[PDB]
Scaffold this active site. Structure first.
Site, PDB file in Angstrom:
ATOM      1  N   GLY A 106      20.586   6.478  23.208  1.00 15.39           N
ATOM      2  CA  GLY A 106      19.240   6.232  22.721  1.00 15.39           C
ATOM      3  C   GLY A 106      19.115   6.683  21.290  1.00 15.39           C
ATOM      4  CD  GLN A 132      17.346  10.780  17.559  1.00 20.86           C
ATOM      5  OE1 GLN A 132      17.101   9.833  18.319  1.00 20.86           O
ATOM      6  NE2 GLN A 132      18.447  11.508  17.660  1.00 20.86           N
ATOM      7  CB  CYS A 191      19.976  15.420  20.865  1.00 19.58           C
ATOM      8  SG  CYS A 191      18.815  14.530  19.764  1.00 19.58           S
ATOM      9  CG  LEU A 192      23.343  10.462  18.660  1.00 17.08           C
ATOM     10  CD1 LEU A 192      23.023   9.017  18.190  1.00 17.08           C
ATOM     11  CD2 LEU A 192      24.879  10.669  18.747  1.00 17.08           C
ATOM     12  CG  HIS A 212      16.099  12.876  24.729  1.00 16.56           C
ATOM     13  ND1 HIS A 212      16.948  13.943  24.902  1.00 16.56           N
ATOM     14  CD2 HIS A 212      16.325  12.409  23.477  1.00 16.56           C
ATOM     15  CE1 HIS A 212      17.636  14.148  23.782  1.00 16.56           C
ATOM     16  NE2 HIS A 212      17.255  13.245  22.895  1.00 16.56           N
ATOM     17  CD  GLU A 213      16.255   8.730  22.515  1.00 18.84           C
ATOM     18  OE1 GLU A 213      15.827   8.926  21.383  1.00 18.84           O
ATOM     19  OE2 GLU A 213      17.385   9.156  22.936  1.00 18.84           O
ATOM     20  CG  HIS A 271      13.949  12.212  19.322  1.00 19.25           C
ATOM     21  ND1 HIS A 271      14.337  13.323  18.624  1.00 19.25           N
ATOM     22  CD2 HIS A 271      15.015  11.858  20.088  1.00 19.25           C
ATOM     23  CE1 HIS A 271      15.570  13.652  18.952  1.00 19.25           C
ATOM     24  NE2 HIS A 271      15.998  12.807  19.868  1.00 19.25           N
TER      25      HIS A 271
HETATM   26  O1  LIG Z   1      20.442  10.995  20.076  1.00 22.49           O
HETATM   27  C1  LIG Z   1      19.963  10.758  21.143  1.00 22.49           C
HETATM   28  C2  LIG Z   1      20.678  10.090  22.264  1.00 22.49           C
HETATM   29  C3  LIG Z   1      21.571  10.922  23.102  1.00 22.49           C
HETATM   30  C4  LIG Z   1      22.830  11.350  22.815  1.00 22.49           C
HETATM   31  N1  LIG Z   1      23.306  12.089  23.859  1.00 22.49           N
HETATM   32  C5  LIG Z   1      22.363  12.171  24.847  1.00 22.49           C
HETATM   33  C6  LIG Z   1      22.409  12.791  26.112  1.00 22.49           C
HETATM   34  C7  LIG Z   1      21.299  12.713  26.922  1.00 22.49           C
HETATM   35  C8  LIG Z   1      20.200  12.015  26.443  1.00 22.49           C
HETATM   36 BR1  LIG Z   1      18.710  11.891  27.556  1.00 22.49          BR
HETATM   37  C9  LIG Z   1      20.123  11.353  25.224  1.00 22.49           C
HETATM   38  C10 LIG Z   1      21.239  11.444  24.401  1.00 22.49           C
HETATM   39  N2  LIG Z   1      18.682  10.927  21.488  1.00 22.49           N
HETATM   40  O2  LIG Z   1      17.675  11.013  20.578  1.00 22.49           O
HETATM   41 ZN   LIG Z   2      17.790  12.898  20.903  1.00 26.78          ZN
END
Ligand SMILES: O=C(Cc1c[nH]c2ccc(Br)cc12)NO
Ligand SMILES: [Zn+2]
Length: 168
Positions: free
Chosen positions: A47, A52, A92-93, A134-135, A138
């Site tokens: 995602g 981001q 998360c990236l 999660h998204e 953000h």
């Molecule tokens: O950058 C990202 C995406 C992402 C990367 N690794 C993850 C593991 C779990 C989850 Br839920 C989302 C992500 N989200 O903003």
């Molecule tokens: Zn994230």
């Protein structure tokens, strides 16, 4: 168009910015969507929220499929209903190489606009529901680490900064 988007990392304060709604889904918004997918896939994520990549508009791209052929676009998403509780060790990236268990709803019902600007409703469970939450976080400047203790958040910041110093 080859994407040139840059994924921000903590502790960049632009990750705390609250995105504005998209006013009209036109060709420019479609280009942003397509670039965000390219960046997401290149960085091996499932995602990406516009926040981001320093775009302060309510746009999310998601693909939870192994074969990278199930493109979900959420423009101006709205959470209509949620139920149950779950959690996985999310990453998360924008928080590279860190993971932690986060409480989430198990099921969500959302409405959003698709890449064509058409409204749609989606019921999701499992990983997809977790990724939607999660998204959407953000887009209101929230990160998965915000659900952890203040000490754990400090340790996460310190580890990402060390990783980011090492690079170059
Ligand atoms: O950058 C990202 C995406 C992402 C990367 N690794 C993850 C593991 C779990 C989850 Br839920 C989302 C992500 N989200 O903003
Ligand atoms: Zn994230």
């Amino acid at each position: 168009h080859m994407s040139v988007l840059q994924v921000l990392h903590i502790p960049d304060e632009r990750l705390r910015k609250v995105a504005k709604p998209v006013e009209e889904v036109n060709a420019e918004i479609q280009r942003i969507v397509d670039d965000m997918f390219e960046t997401m896939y290149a960085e091996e994520g499932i995602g990406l929220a516009a926040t981001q990549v320093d775009i302060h508009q309510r746009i999310i791209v998601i693909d939870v499929s192994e074969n990278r052929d199930e493109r979900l676009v959420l423009i101006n998403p709205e959470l209509l209903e949620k139920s149950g509780e779950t959690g996985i060790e999310e990453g998360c990236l924008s928080i590279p190489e860190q993971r932690a268990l986060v409480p989430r709803a198990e099921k969500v019902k959302i409405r959003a606009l698709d890449r064509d600007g058409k409204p749609f409703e989606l019921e999701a469970d499992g990983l997809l529901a977790i990724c939607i939450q999660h998204e959407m976080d953000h887009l209101v400047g929230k990160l998965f680490m915000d659900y952890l203790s203040p000490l754990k958040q400090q340790r996460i910041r310190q580890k990402v900064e060390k990783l980011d110093r090492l690079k170059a």
